Amino acid sequence: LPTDTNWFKHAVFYEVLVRAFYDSNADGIGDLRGLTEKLDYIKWLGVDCLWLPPFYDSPLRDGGYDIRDFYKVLPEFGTVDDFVTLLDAAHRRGIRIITDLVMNHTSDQHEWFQESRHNPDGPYGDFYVWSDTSDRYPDARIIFVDTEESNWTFDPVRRQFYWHRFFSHQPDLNYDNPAVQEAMLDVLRFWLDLGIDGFRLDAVPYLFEREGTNCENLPETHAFLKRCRKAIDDEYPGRVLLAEANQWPADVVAYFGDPDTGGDECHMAFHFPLMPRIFMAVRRESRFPISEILAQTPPIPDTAQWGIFLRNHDELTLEMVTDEERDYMYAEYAKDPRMKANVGIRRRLAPLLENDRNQIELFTALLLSLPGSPVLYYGDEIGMGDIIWLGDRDSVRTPMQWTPDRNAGFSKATPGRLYLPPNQDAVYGYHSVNVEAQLDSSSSLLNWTRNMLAVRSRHDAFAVGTFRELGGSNPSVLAYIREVTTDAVLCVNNLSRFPQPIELNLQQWAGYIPVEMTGYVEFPSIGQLPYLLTLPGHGFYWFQLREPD
Amino acid sequence: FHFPLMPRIFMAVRRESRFPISEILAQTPPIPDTAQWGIFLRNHDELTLEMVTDEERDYMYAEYAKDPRMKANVGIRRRLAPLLENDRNQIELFTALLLSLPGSPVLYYGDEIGMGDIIWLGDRDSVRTPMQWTPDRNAGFSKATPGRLYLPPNQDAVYGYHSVNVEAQLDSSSSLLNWTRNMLAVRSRHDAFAVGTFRELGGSNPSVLAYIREVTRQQGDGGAKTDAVLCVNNLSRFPQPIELNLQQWAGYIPVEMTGYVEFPSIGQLPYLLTLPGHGFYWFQLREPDP
Amino acid sequence: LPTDTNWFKHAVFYEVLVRAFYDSNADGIGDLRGLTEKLDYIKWLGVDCLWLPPFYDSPLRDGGYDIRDFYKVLPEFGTVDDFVTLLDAAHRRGIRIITDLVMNHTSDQHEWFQESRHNPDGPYGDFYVWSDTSDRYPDARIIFVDTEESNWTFDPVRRQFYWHRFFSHQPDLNYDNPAVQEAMLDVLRFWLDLGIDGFRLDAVPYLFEREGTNCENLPETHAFLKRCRKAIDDEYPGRVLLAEANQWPADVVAYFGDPDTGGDECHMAFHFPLMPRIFMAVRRESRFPISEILAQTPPIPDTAQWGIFLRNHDELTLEMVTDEERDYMYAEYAKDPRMKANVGIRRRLAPLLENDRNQIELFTALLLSLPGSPVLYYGDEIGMGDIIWLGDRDSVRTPMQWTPDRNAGFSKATPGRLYLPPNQDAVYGYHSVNVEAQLDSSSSLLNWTRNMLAVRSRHDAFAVGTFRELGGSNPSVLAYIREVTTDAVLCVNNLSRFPQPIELNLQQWAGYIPVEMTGYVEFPSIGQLPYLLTLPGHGFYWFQLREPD
Ligand SMILES: [Ca+2]
Ligand SMILES: [Ca+2]
Ligand SMILES: [Cl-]
Ligand SMILES: [Cl-]
Ligand SMILES: [Cl-]
Ligand SMILES: [Cl-]
Ligand SMILES: [Cl-]
Ligand SMILES: [Cl-]
Ligand SMILES: [Cl-]
Ligand SMILES: [Cl-]
Ligand SMILES: [Cl-]
Ligand SMILES: [Cl-]
Ligand SMILES: [Mg+2]
Ligand SMILES: [Mg+2]
């Protein structure tokens, strides 16, 4: 695709798992050719970039975040040639593709690790972090404290301990070895040469360890990220790096790099607390949890962008971000029985909201109008459910529900051969929830979602506009303006389950005509008196503020 | 019974215009003080399966045949949800109208949970299938074998008893059942719905039907139960503004009935209300404080 | 097809409703083009001739047995050209087609009747049976006694009464008018010229009325049937006429015509009491109800053949045949709560047998091995259920269940537009019972049924062989031999729900080797001692009796 260094600021992303989308070869597992065959749907929906979770060769002990070979596609998905076919077909439709790349560690099945343990004096001997003792780095917490007794594991072949921030079968790479830094840069270039549009870099806060520190966010870690950005800048302009740092927003800004250069590390990073705050704002019928999180988020470099999504947990660690000192809602999450029940489990949007269509629309409207580039998760656009018993992550990784036919139209294989089963319950089951059934009526969730994407795409203000919170009489309503300079939009959102009035001081736009964006009806022009808007429970409106003749 | 009401409401929504409703109400002659109209959300009389019409006096006479939904169901009783293609917003709108327009309303069993129908059973029997109490065997209507039921329950993915039943709706405050029960409770506390006058307010926007209903008020009353009520109904599928001339109620405070939120007091200027597609509001008009 | 005057004796028929089989045009109603597109399935199943119930233009007030135009296909099915397309496609596969033709009456919407009533002095004035009184023919019973107050109805246009044996909207044709006889012969020739292989002639016992008689089975009625047979014989050799006479078998033999000519009326007629007797034989665990009905059936002409099927009711009148004087089981049917519940309602095979797979196989084995040409009803080969609330006839006329997809794969229309809905219950619903699901395992009812048809087709004895009941020690077991002279088969059937032994005197075949027909295992050769066979509850065996070396 022609280079366009700001495409990611205007993009709506769609996170879609290769294994889950479409099985074209009847082995019961989604594949790259299958995903390629469904690109017309993705184009029609109106998203701009696919985000694929790891599809590399892997023993799949930790969902594929345990990588066995960075250079090879998991065989059941296809080969590198199928990946290029997918890339070309997407680009032909103006769709880009990014993927997750785990930087911190590999599977213990990786040939580098097997050489490291079997041949310590060989070229891979120092590719991992080895020690005669388990005493080093004692200030680093154990991320998976209920599963791992220690961040050090004794290897029976090498008879030394090796370091791992994640599970024991995921040994950490030794970034103090210059050959490791070059090998990982080479992985980046391999996929960039194939034509991938970018990566989400995963587990990067953990790259370097140092005594006297908690071994996260070290300056040498940021230094390596600068090398990655520089390689991109110099060799592949127009590609993107996204940071997965599950930290309070103030701490995450460091991952965009030096502000004096306009940003010299990641182009994007995720704003994790957004969904938990929106969720609590609705539970409490108060705009404040949202107002406060946005107001307290520091400025980022102008060429950079936050990523946002409607999830309460990071998919790598299954942890919800928080901060004892800087999060006023810190103790409040535990008081909410809905938040409490789902601790450490990914859930889809409809189940998080008890399948309340009004709330699904409200949360989606906020996702599409708040500052940042939004990520939609595959299946949320039809209101798919999840199956929590499959696992904390696999809960939301069931097959895409295309039709009410056998296997939800995901596969021609026998049901017992599917990698995971489709939902089969009365509410979320494929007999009632599927793409085919929603294609017809203009009032389905799918068509509503598609229309909202079309509307958003016609207003640059949503992607790159300023953000001005309007306050107002009523704390149950969140109202704001997005503006870019010629394009100005007003968004009003009712966090209460009951109808609410709001009087807004819109004097600065006096004379302007609010045009509602779905039906194009012209509302009364703005005057010097406060503008009354009335919303039903959980309702919202988007208005284009049109200049007077 | 006032038979043309539902066909006119149905057409008003199809047309996104208040007039088919404005008109049948305006043209309905006054009736004795002792008397009351009965109203219901059906397009056919159950005895004859005929829809009432009149070549000379119904301006919509030829228009019904032009609507394919209307045409398909000629001579067949259908339940409310199926008539409205299971659109929850429309079910609420039609129900709000049924509960606030003049007359005494009749709800049909099962419409409060959004039951479907089974047209193949017959032109009347379509709507006479068992009440769906639970997702159990026979929808919890009977312990008999299924082959012995007088008629079978709905079994499809949309309306079937595994999905649509009383038990499933009892829990959530947001179910259609709980919403309907709350609307009935609200109505029962406001006399103007049952015996109030009817004053159509007109307004800038033809897509919105607005009216006020008032109690004449005699001896030993004064309270919410006898306060005037204001109802506003959006017949368009899109969000709509409406500006109302309520100057005779200057100073009164509209209080929305379900959540009890006070809206700005009525002034001499036109009062702006904004509605989502197919939305409605009910307000108690409270007399101001001296 | 090349003429073969005995094809009907070797045929397995498949009764299939055009409206129910396959909707190719997405109007929700099965059609001729759709039936044509499913001929590969019909060929694969292994049936030899389709039997289509009436598909003529009709207001459908009595299931299409009320005909408005004998020369026109009901428009929603297609036109005469689609019918010829179907005919040619079937013939190409070696499949023949017969259809129901109602001879006794037309709809009151038929143009003949409208002319008869409006223009009495015109050419159609005497096409129906008119009278100033309702007094004629008082000895004729009212068939539909719960619905029709009289066999005479007063017409408000002509202001005379007209005769009808069926419903009032089905006026009887006047066969004493020679122009009526010629017009009906012309209907026969029209369809024969198109290429149809034959007709089931319906309601023929009622053609003529005479004072002093009950107006059934009159000699003039048989005389007209001889005209039909003669027209066939002379102009279209190799076509077939089937009689629908719901009468005791002794009375039905008259419909084959004069034995001295080898039969000069219908080629075939149905043996209605067979299923009720098999049903009662199983209920009582005794072979006698079957033995007796077969033994008491008189010989028929050698070029003629009984038709047999697994139904308890005639589809025209919804009556079960019986005889107060000649049926020893006459009072017994009412004592059986299963028979009692289903009086006057068509039910499919699986529901009649409470979905007991062992019994479905037993009844099917009997259908395929007893004397006569069997008719399979569409859907029974996969074990379809019925929906009794749809009506006494429409109970068994729901869409063919092809797949577990939307509308059971019968149509692409919306479900609310289907002519009738598919079964949706946990036992018989299309999510569990459909062709697709049964295609795979060799042990499905569909594949079992197909294999039984293949086996039957390889032994002429089943079609045209003699029938010798073997008696035996055990009254719970029905054993017989079918033989043609070189091909001899032994069938043994356990009517008891428990395992049963039977000792058979097979001395006449001493030395012969019984070879079981499904697995081809050779059983001990027959000697002079009685041959012991042991069967599980409701089991059966078919053996080929092979000549010794
Ligand atoms: Ca590390
Ligand atoms: Ca007759
Ligand atoms: Cl995947
Ligand atoms: Cl590869
Ligand atoms: Cl994540
Ligand atoms: Cl989550
Ligand atoms: Cl009525
Ligand atoms: Cl109706
Ligand atoms: Cl048919
Ligand atoms: Cl035709
Ligand atoms: Cl029959
Ligand atoms: Cl039957
Ligand atoms: Mg696959
Ligand atoms: Mg059709």
From Swiss-Prot, chain B:
Catalyzes the reversible interconversion of maltose and trehalose by transglucosylation. Maltose is the preferred substrate. To a lesser extent, also displays amylase activity, catalyzing the endohydrolysis of (1->4)-alpha-D-glucosidic linkages in glycogen and maltooligosaccharides such as maltoheptaose, to produce maltose which then can be converted to trehalose. TreS plays a key role in the utilization of trehalose for the production of glycogen and alpha-glucan via the TreS-Pep2 branch involved in the biosynthesis of maltose-1-phosphate (M1P). It comes from the Bacteria. Substrate binds at H44, D45. Homohexamer. Disruption phenotype: Cells lacking this gene do not accumulate increased amounts of glycogen in the presence of trehalose and show only a small effect in alpha-glucan. Combined inactivation of treS with glgB or glgC completely blocks alpha-glucan production. The gene is treS. This is Trehalose synthase/amylase TreS. Belongs to the glycosyl hydrolase 13 family. TreS subfamily. The chain holds residues 298 to 587 of 593 of the full protein. Maltose-1-phosphate (M1P), the building block required for alpha-glucan production, is generated by two alternative routes: the TreS-Pep2 branch and the GlgC-GlgM branch, however it seems that the GlgC-GlgM branch provides most of M1P for the GlgE pathway in M.smegmatis. Disulfide bonds: none annotated.
